[PDB]
C-alpha cells in the first residue's frame, strides 16, 4: 500500500522496538537508505513514547534535518510544524503540537543549557553518529551523565556500518541491532593520471556518462556551494553545446540551500530525463536520492583546518579518507550494479588518503566547544567524557584565543561577555562583534554585516559574463572595506524592495541575500532577549570599521607589498584577494583586519577592512 514498506527498517520494526523497550541505550546499525532517519521516530511514535513527551532525532547536517522532517510529515499526513517539526540553528519549525522533532546536534546542545536533563524528551535518536561530528561527540559525553540522572529516557544511537563498533562500549555495553543491507557490486574506476582541474574533469565525466550510458541518475561529489555552482554552470554550458543530447536535470545540494531547492532533488524527473545531483558529502550518508547509478568523486571535502604555513585556521579543500571514498562509491550500488568514477589515481588513493577520518574533536578549532561546555558547568575539556579527547595543543589555542577575546578572564573563567557570546550560534569573534556594536552605536548595521558573513557570498561571477559581472561588483564597492561593501549591497537590495529581478540585473545571488535576511531576523530576536538596543551610526561608516577592528584585532595585518600583508599575531604572509573592495582604493592601506583565510593557489585573506593604526594601539 505504501512506498515506506519497501524499506529494510519496516521488517525489523517489532524486534527493534523489543530491544528499545528492554534497554536504556541501543545502537542501530544499517546502511544509508535503510530507513533509520524516516522510520525510527515513527516506530517510537506508534509504540507510545510520544504519550509522555517528545521524540527527538538529532543529526549533524541542517539539510538532512529539514528534508527528513518534510518527508516524515508527508508519510504521516500532518502539516510540517505540527505533529512533525524541525529545529535548526536559525529556524524553529515546531509548535505545542510537535511530538517528533528533527534537529541539528547544536540545537539540542543549546537546549541542554537551560534543560540539562532534556525533560521535554521521552526518547532521543542520535542519528549519523558514525560521522563523529564535534557536537555529536559533545552530546554522547552529555548523555553519559543524563542517562544516570534519568532512567526513563531511551537513547538510540544510529550508525552507517563503518565506525559503528565503539558506541556500544562507550554506553556500558549497549546492545547493537543491525538492519541487513542489499548492495550491488559497484565498478570503481580510478583516473589514469592525477587531476589538476577536478571541476573540468567532473563535467567531462558527467557528459560522457550522459551521452553513452543507459538510464540511471548521476551523483557528483564536490566540496561547497562555490565549486558546485561552477560545476552546474559548466554542465549546462557544455550540454547546450552538444548536438541533440538527451535532457539532463542538474540539481545542487549544499548546507545553506533553501527548502525549495531541497525539495527538487527528490522529485522524479519526466520519463526519459536523467538527473545529475551535484552535492557535498551531505550525499555520503545523510540522505539518499532514488535511482543513482553513476557517482563522480572529486576526492575532496572543504574544511576549516589548522595550517602549519599559517599557524592558524585556513578554509581549504582536503583529501577524503579511503572510508569516505567507499561510502561515496556505495551510493551507485542501491538501484543496480552502478559505476563510481574517482577523479584521482589508485596510487593517490593508497598513499595520499588515510584509511579513516580522524574524529572532528581532534582536528577542529575548539573555541565554541570550550565556551559552550564552560556554560554547561565544565571547567576543563579533559574533565568531560569524550569518546576521543581533544589534544592539549588545540585546547591551549582555544583557551588563549578566548582569553584574548575577553570571553575568559585572566584565570580562564567565563566572563559576562563570554556568557553573552554563548547566546549567539556563531564563531566567538563574530558574536563579540555583534555584542560590541551596541556600544559603538552601529548594532543596526552590524547585525546586517554579521548576517552577510553567515551566508554564501553575494557576488555572482558567471564565467561567460566575467567583465560585465566585475563591472557591476565595482559599483557596490566601499573601497575601505569588504564588510561595508556587504552592508552596501544589502541596503541597496532592501531599497529595491528585496527584488530577485534586481539581483539578476546586478549579478547578485538573491538566495544569498534572502538567506542573509532569514539570519538577520533570527539574530534581531536574540539581540532583543539579550536586551541589546538597536542603534544606527547613520552616515558615519568609519565607526563600523573601528568596531570591526575591535572584533577582529587578532587578525590584524600590516602591508608588506604587492597585495601581501603580514599577520601581526604570527608574522605569516597572507595575500589580499583580487576580488577585494580594497583594490578600488588609490593605494593599499598600511593596516587591515580580515574575516578568514582561504587556500586556493595560495593563502588569501577573505573579507578585509582597512583600519587606522591608532585604532589598533587603543586595543589588546
Ligand atoms: N527529504 C528526505 N531526506 C531523506 N531521505 C528522503 C527524503 N525524502 C525522501 N527520502 C527517501 O527516504 C529513503 C531513505 O530513508 P531514510 O530514513 O533516509 O534512511 P537512512 O537514514 O537509513 O539513510 C530514500 O528513498 C530517500 O530518497
Ligand atoms: Mg539517515
Author numbering: 302 to 921
Passage from the reporting paper:
The protein studied in this work is pre-mRNA-splicing factor 16 (Prp16) and is required for the transition of the spliceosome from the C to the C* state. Therefore, Prp16 binds the 3′-end sequence of the intron RNA and translocates towards the spliceosome, leading to dissociation of the branching factors Yju2 and Cwc25 and thereby enabling exon ligation. Prp16 belongs to the DEAH-box proteins, which share a highly conserved helicase core formed by two RecA-like domains. All DEAH-box helicases have a common C-terminal domain architecture comprising winged-helix (WH), helix-bundle (HB) and oligosaccharide-binding fold (OB-fold) domains.
The spliceosomal DEAH-box helicase Prp16 from the thermo­philic ascomycete C. thermophilum (ctPrp16) was crystallized in complex with ADP to mimic a post-catalytic state. An N- and C-terminally truncated construct ctPrp16 (302–920) was used for crystallization, as the removed parts are expected to be mainly disordered according to the PredictProtein server. The reported structure of ctPrp16 in complex with ADP was determined at a resolution of 1.9 Å and was refined to an R work of 19.3% and an R free of 23.8%. The atomic model comprises ctPrp16 (302–920), one ADP molecule, one magnesium ion, one polyethylene glycol (PEG) molecule and 423 water molecules. The overall assembly of ctPrp16 can be divided into six different entities: the N-terminal extension (302–311), two RecA-like domains [referred to as RecA1 (312–468) and RecA2 (467–661)], the WH domain (662–728), the HB domain (729–842) and the OB-fold domain (843–920). In the structure reported here, an ADP molecule as well as the catalytically required magnesium ion are present at the interface between the RecA1 and RecA2 domains, corresponding to ctPrp16 in the post-catalytic state. The magnesium ion is hexavalently coordinated by four water molecules, Thr342 located within motif I and the β-phosphate of the ADP molecule. While Arg635 (motif VI) belongs to this conserved region of DEAH-box helicases, Thr593 and Asp595 do not. The adenine moiety does not form any polar contacts with ctPrp16 residues, but the adenine interacts with Phe567 via π–π stacking. While all other X-ray structures harbor the β-hairpin between the WH and OB-fold domains, independent of the nucleotide- or substrate-loading state, in ctPrp16 the upper part of the β-hairpin with its loop region is pushed out of the cleft and interacts exclusively with the OB-fold domain. However, this conformation appears to be an artifact caused by interaction with a symmetry mate within the crystal lattice. Superposition of the ctPrp16 structure with the structure of the ctPrp22–RNA complex shows that the conserved Lys is located virtually in the same position in both structures, meaning that RNA binding seems to be unaffected by the unique conformation of the β-hairpin in ctPrp16.
